[PDB]
Amino acid sequence: SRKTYTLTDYLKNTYRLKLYSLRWISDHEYLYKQENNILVFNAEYGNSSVFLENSTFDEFGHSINDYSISPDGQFILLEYNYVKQWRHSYTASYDIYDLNKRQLITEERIPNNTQWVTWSPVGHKLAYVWNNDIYVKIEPNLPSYRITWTGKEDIIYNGITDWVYEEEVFSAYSALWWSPNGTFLAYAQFNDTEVPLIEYSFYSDESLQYPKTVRVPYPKAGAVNPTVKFFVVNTDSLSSVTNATSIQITAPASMLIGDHYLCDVTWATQERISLQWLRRIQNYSVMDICDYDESSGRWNCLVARQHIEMSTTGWVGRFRPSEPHFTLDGNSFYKIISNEEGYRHICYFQIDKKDCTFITKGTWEVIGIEALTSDYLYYISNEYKGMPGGRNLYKIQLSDYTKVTCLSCELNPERCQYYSVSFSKEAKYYQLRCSGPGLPLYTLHSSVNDKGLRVLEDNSALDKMLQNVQMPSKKLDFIILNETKFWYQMILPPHFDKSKKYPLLLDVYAGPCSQKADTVFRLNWATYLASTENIIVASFDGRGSGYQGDKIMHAINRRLGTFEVEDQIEAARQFSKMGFVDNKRIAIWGWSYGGYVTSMVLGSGSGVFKCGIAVAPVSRWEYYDSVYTERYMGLPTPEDNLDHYRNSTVMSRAENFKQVEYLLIHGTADDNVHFQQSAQISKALVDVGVDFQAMWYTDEDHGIASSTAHQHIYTHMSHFIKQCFSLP
């Protein structure tokens, strides 16, 4: 009798999740924007003051995309004129508001088309990047010191990352790293001088008469990669007439025999930096600990102090080598490491010592180390009730590692099974965020005795609303394939009847270390397909999937487009044999790696799927970028892995598409997974006589995320699926 969840509701964002985004600003206080005022909250007692009134800047003349306040909080930075580049990078203008006076600073402004800005971690110093060169303001109203002079568009980058680094390495435009004092500015330089350029058309506005070609240095598998150097400047000794002195830190000798990357930089103390590096064959990584010479002004990294990580089974880390979490003193650290059994767990390392100690063990994995005092290490794992799809917070007593307490497990156990966390400085207080399986819940807690303090957002407004809709439900369970347990979720229509036969949509991603079966609450496309269209949407984590150990995750090492594909069919097969899925109507769809897999499934000849959708798919691994692809596939040369690079393309199995119905979609401005990839699939289908559907989306990138293209793509896919399943 109630309304169902409709496409419109999805697209028009009718039922909205309420969030609670806070920024810890000390051990006991946090920032929060409410009704557009910036507020400081006291964690302990719950009371708040207004940092910055909503009324301030209503005469400022520009609408403001973002802000960032001094640590030692006398300035606020205002970001405006935001122009997006890639996933993390962008260009903007900035003004600085002097909080003590009622004033914008007026002279020495941070320039326009600034590519990155950062406050120092204390005080109110500023580093910014402009035309690929680094600058430093000591005071906001003073002239900046130029640190580098080598910036050249698309060629040399100081303090920012190039495309592959932004995307595959640091998940960030930034390549600047302030000392904890603020004394030093560490920064990376990239040189893309010989990196080949992916070119593509942008058509933009109807009034542009000639298309623009966009040209992006983008190393595809086996191509010349960017090189990198690393520098540290002392920001306390800058002259106005002397060019600043940047000291180089050289990679270790065992990284210099060949192509390598900088994968991680962590400050350990005021005078010690941690630099992890990686070989290009991502087999082998080195952590260097560099100390600062008081007398010399130099940085030395003692060999007897390096830390090596290797794997014979696969690559180092889930996507990159893990991050070290240092003790206050900087003489030791804790870091996630795959154990002997293949399980990622926390290892305690001493800096001068060489082997490490495991602080956790067992048939589950650690997801992150979240805070560390002298007393306690806080982390997230999927230990609870043995569900890898699950996330919870844990507290180790460091005087005895067997005394672990779970902080989130039983706070709201039917409602909350997927937490993330946000500790204040010195882990005095934390916010918890349960992401599912019920409505998201944001709580505030005091570490002292782990007293719950206060609910922040409970989403009850959403709850009252969703009581009036025909919500689908979620089944999280496992099947068995060859002795091992693999998990799947199903999103099930309202009033699911196990005696009926429902159409089933396999929603696939299945990349190395992915997880599509989990406890989180989403309101999405699947929600609509289940509520209105009575379609079971199923998802399944097969070999190559993560959070369940190496045996499963490294199964796909050097062999993408293989066990992850077979296992999707094997599970679709099994869902078929269950007596509520009508095997005549099984479809499959995926975005991105999802598309590559959906296509590899459509082309397997399984005859299990009526039809499916591949959006922005990888079709051939030589088209994708070096850092991601080489991590799973090695190099595409005869001496290495050319054979399997060639064996695993969507085009190789074009004929088999004649048995299936296929919708193939790709935005033309995809800088990530290039249009070329869908353009080689479509050609291969044509070359063989296979009919299919296509959709390009002019000037859309990898996410096809403009308001219109979003509504349109999901509209297009609904029609393709309703009619695939003979639904009116």
Place this chain on the structure above:
Amino acid sequence: SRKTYTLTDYLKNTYRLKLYSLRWISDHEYLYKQENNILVFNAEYGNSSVFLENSTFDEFGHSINDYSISPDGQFILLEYNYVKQWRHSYTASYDIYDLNKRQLITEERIPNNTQWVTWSPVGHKLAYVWNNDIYVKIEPNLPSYRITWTGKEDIIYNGITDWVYEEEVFSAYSALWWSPNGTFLAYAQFNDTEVPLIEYSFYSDESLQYPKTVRVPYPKAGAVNPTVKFFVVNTDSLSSVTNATSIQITAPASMLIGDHYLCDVTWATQERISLQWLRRIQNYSVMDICDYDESSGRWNCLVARQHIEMSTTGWVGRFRPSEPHFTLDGNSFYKIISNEEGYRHICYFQIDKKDCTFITKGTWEVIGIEALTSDYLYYISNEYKGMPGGRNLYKIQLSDYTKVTCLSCELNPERCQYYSVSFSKEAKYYQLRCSGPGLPLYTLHSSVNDKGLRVLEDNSALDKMLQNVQMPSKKLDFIILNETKFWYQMILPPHFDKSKKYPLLLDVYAGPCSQKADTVFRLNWATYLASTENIIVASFDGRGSGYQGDKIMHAINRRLGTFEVEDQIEAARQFSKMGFVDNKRIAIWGWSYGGYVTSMVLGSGSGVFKCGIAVAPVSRWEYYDSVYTERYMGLPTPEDNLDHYRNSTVMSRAENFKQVEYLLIHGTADDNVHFQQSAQISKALVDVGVDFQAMWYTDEDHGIASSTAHQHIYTHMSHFIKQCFSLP
């Protein structure tokens, strides 16, 4: 007749039309290729011998693409390694083989990657273009002589055309023209320096890691255009110590004031050249007659013998200034001109004398002048039976204009209402080539007494085959919109039943001077649609269409996307009325201009059409080239015609497509109508929320003509129509 005309039949060519393609080599001899033998035929008597054995070049080594025999039969040119460029351009390697010995020449071979080669019209001289520069070989075994040194890729073209000139001005890669002596070589040189480029991606074979970017100089409407110069070289005064002297003929003072085109190049005598020039506003045109001053070595264009052509209702000529045909003495010419009633007729000009005299007149038009002798002028017209979609050969006694004989009207009045002709040298003989409405007939005749020498090919082999197919029939009629006859055509289902109600596909082109309603016999897609699917395919010639004089042809001037679009609709509306057309099931389709007209219709909100397909459609005239567009549209500036450039985009109609089902198709490497045109359509559709189906074809150009892509698009289109129409 039981079996039907099948899509496979169309695609696979079960049923081919037989041809007869001859090249005359004198006033009584031609060559025909039968097998891979070149045979010579005596036109008067019918005897024939083998000129060239099919087995002459078995041990050549390379696949031979095409031949060309010198006008003194002494040597043959063999064309190999042919690589397409645009519609007429290509590069190939060439060999010259001696016929009087039996040996390939090996000294001084035509270079590889030769852009163009041609023989002198008499004898065995060669002119050729390599690397944008012109070379002259007096003898095939001898070193060539260099005429130009200014060649340069995509900037300077000598002897060959750039992109616009090839496609829009000359219909030819060639910008060279021998005088009949083979004494003088005349040639144009194009300068594209400031011509902006169209760039698109070309994906190529799989093995290519990074798409290539294609860059072609292409002036869109209003852009900077190529400049031209014209030169005449004396081919007989060449020395191999001295550099070649090229005499320049400059354009008339009234062309030099602004932007202008070189239109036409016609030698009149051994020592006299006709140049036609066209203003960038294409309503003024000047013909210059230019003579060799034996004494000075120069070329003088007297203004006494200059001729002006102006149009006040539209533009000049049909697609350009008509070509003149000079009488042997070089002192008079005949040339097609819009008469004062606005119909195109043969006009008689005397070189030094004013005006001209019209030698034909009426409510019909000369299609072309074909042959000129001492006593007669032969020409082709649509007079016969007031049928503008028909064509016959005609004869005018030069000594009394009123004495006009129809050569072809009555040869076979039922099989044949559509001729073209190929006259021997000195017009002693002609091959009549009948295209319809019955099967093509090919007959040879003699001019003396207009005797029918022999049937050359009667397509009897096809005739018998088709007796066994349930062939569709063609209806040619007309309707009256104001008090004007506009002609349409219908391809009608076999066993047509005027009391059943048939789905209608309206097959549009409808560009300026087009004719879609004629008597030509075709085996094509509509043939399949009619015979196998019992769909009626209708084409209609409304305003802007051709060969019915200027009131109709010029109705569309400065007005593209108005009247012609309106008229298609009104026409479908008229088809509605007739009780054999189901008005729930009317569709429209078209390619190039017809793709544009379709979209424009579709988005008009007429409600007449259920759906429609548009292939490589124009969407916005600013995106298309300058020569074609501005010819109809004027310039896209505010003072000229910007208002109608903006009032006539496909994009401005997007909201209306909600009402219809659209199919939009384009080749990614279309260099004529750029992918951009469709990329802009799809965006506007995305932006406004309209659903529609799409298909790009990667690396296909304008014709979408690789055999596999050809098959794929008709298959795709066939399904789309079949499901639009509720047809299984």
